[model samples]
Target: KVFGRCELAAAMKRHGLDNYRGYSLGNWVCAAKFESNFNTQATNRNTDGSTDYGILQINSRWWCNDGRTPGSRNLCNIPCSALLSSDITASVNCAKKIVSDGNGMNAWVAWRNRCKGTDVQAWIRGCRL
Candidate 1:
């Protein structure tokens, strides 16, 4: 489903973000869902748990603290949650780094492709954030 008004508003509030020239949480979340089903805890052991782990499935060893050692926090560490809670812009920026560093619009494009051409009629929705 496309990002509903409520969800987008919450995301924006959580980050204290204003409208930007490019990028939107609504669109980013769409791509996130497509790539990993929006599973923040997903892990990909492509290289023996040393690569592509956690939300956004980032290569842990390369992108995060370190996945090569035992008890190492993956990419979904508090840094990520803090970003999501305190600054969604930082969160999306982190994800973009993993995907393509904002050149090709990897996650944004995915979301648009998945959510484009959708219409729903609703009178009003309550806002929580």
Candidate 2:
């Protein structure tokens, strides 16, 4: 499922992501945009032979099982496919854990490379939340 920006903002707010792990909702929303464009089914294969999963582009190397991959930590204890679902609970939960590990949004290269230091306020502009 692909969500509109406003809809995704509302969902992120509902999930208490507005200020999760010291990162603002704008950062998350911007990261999500650069990560997957709000598409739940998005996936990307990295040059390191790992796959990035779902809206957050979680990596299979440490987060979730991609079935064909070996040595995955599966820290989220979820199948990578689960992250691809419209229900983002698993993805969001895993993201929180990742952030808690002390990297902040640095856990997401997309966030660091794109959203960091940018005017992210437009990510949730007009979302009324």
Candidate 1, number of clashes:
1
Scanning candidate 1 in windows of ten residues, the lowest lDDT window is: 116-125
Q: Give the alpha-carbon lDDT of every model.
A: 0.45, 0.89
lDDT of 2: 0.89
Model 1, range 1-129, lDDT digits (tens) per residue? 233456644664465432333544444444455545654454456545554433344554544554264555544353323332322454455555544545544434444566444321120134454
Model 1's alpha-carbon lDDT is 0.45
Clashing residue pairs found in predicted model 2: none
Model 2 TM-score relative to the real fold:
0.95
lDDT of 2 by residue, 1-129 (tens): 998998888888888888897788999889999999999999999887889988899999998988766766898999989999998888888888888888899989989999999999989888878
- The C-alpha TM-scores of every prediction are 0.46, 0.95
Runs of candidate 2 with Cα error greater than 4 angstroms are none
